[PDB]
Structure 1
Amino acid sequence: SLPVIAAPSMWTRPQIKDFKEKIQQDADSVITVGRGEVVTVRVPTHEEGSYLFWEFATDNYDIGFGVYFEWTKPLLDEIVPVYRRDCHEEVYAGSHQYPGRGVYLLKFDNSYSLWRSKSVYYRVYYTR
């Protein structure tokens, strides 16, 4: 049988001020998504890893968020369908079990925004 892909988990947590303060302590964890832009963040599966955990937030506006899995032309699986989230109001978080070796694509989608740039604070971990 082809690999069964686990459903992702998603949740929020309220402390967005503290989250962004923590993340701001490193420049590279802060992304500017221009008007009409889509920023993709590639997160490879670690050789000792089992799960991917993500957190993200924005400053003044919502943004589209999706997760895809790239198998190592290459096959792409939809893990979290892209949808607008109010990650300016709360920290958005989620996880997914490794379906196999490959690369996760975190997509921060600002396609729909004509006039607004978004600042994206994000963080990712993995488990053994």
Structure 2
Amino acid sequence: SLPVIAAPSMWTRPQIKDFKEKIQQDADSVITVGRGEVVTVRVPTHEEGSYLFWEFATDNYDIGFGVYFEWTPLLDEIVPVYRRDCHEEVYAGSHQYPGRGVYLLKFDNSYSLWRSKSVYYRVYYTR
């Protein structure tokens, strides 16, 4: 049979100001998504069974967010892209590695005609 993929986990936590100021230290962890733009963050390949952790937030507005997995071009839909209010709270989640491959974090502003978004993000994995 084809691999069964684990359901992702998602949660929020209330301290956004502290997150941003912490993430602001590394300037490359903060990216501007232009009007009508989609920025895809590609996480380096890791071993099966591990977990990817992601966190993100924005300043003044919501942004579209989803997660796909690219096998070592087959893609799987982990977290469907949807708009989140990550300006109100820090958004975080996790997924178990189905196999060896690249994770794609989609920050999707494509619906926004007049507004650029500032995205503060961070990622971990388990050894």
Residue 2 (structure 1) shift: 1.2
More displaced, 41-50 or 100-109?
41-50
Asked if structure 2 preserves the Cα contact closer than 8 Å seen for 1:49 and 1:127, the reply is no
Question: 1:21 Cα shift?
Answer: 0.4
Determine helix, strand or coil for the equivalent of 1:45: strand
Q: Secondary structure at the match of 1:103?
A: strand
The number of residues matched between the two structures is 127
Does the alignment pair 1:9 with 2:9?
Answer: yes
> Aligned to 2:46, what secondary structure does the other structure show?
coil
TM-score scaled by structure 2? 0.97
Q: Deviations over 1:22-80 (max 9, x none)?
A: 000001000100000000000023248700000000000000000000000x1000000
User: When the two structures are superposed, what TM-score results if normalisation uses the length of structure 1?
Assistant: 0.96
Larger CA deviation: 94-103 vs 37-46: 37-46
Q: 5+ unaligned residues in a row in structure 1: which ranges?
A: none
Q: Percent identity?
A: 100
* Residue 100 in structure 1 maps to residue 99 in structure 2: yes
Given the superposition, is the C-alpha separation of residues 49 and 32 from structure 1 closer, same or farther in structure 2, using an over 3 Å criterion?
Answer: farther
1:1-128 pair list within 5 angstroms: 1-47=1-47, 50-72=50-72, 74-128=73-127
1:79-125 alpha-carbon deviations (Å, 9 max, x no partner): 00000000000000000000000000000000000000000000000
Runs of 4 or more above 2 Å deviation: 44-49
Q: Which segment is superposed worse, 44-53 or 20-29?
A: 44-53
Q: Where do 5+ consecutive residues of structure 2 fail to align?
A: none
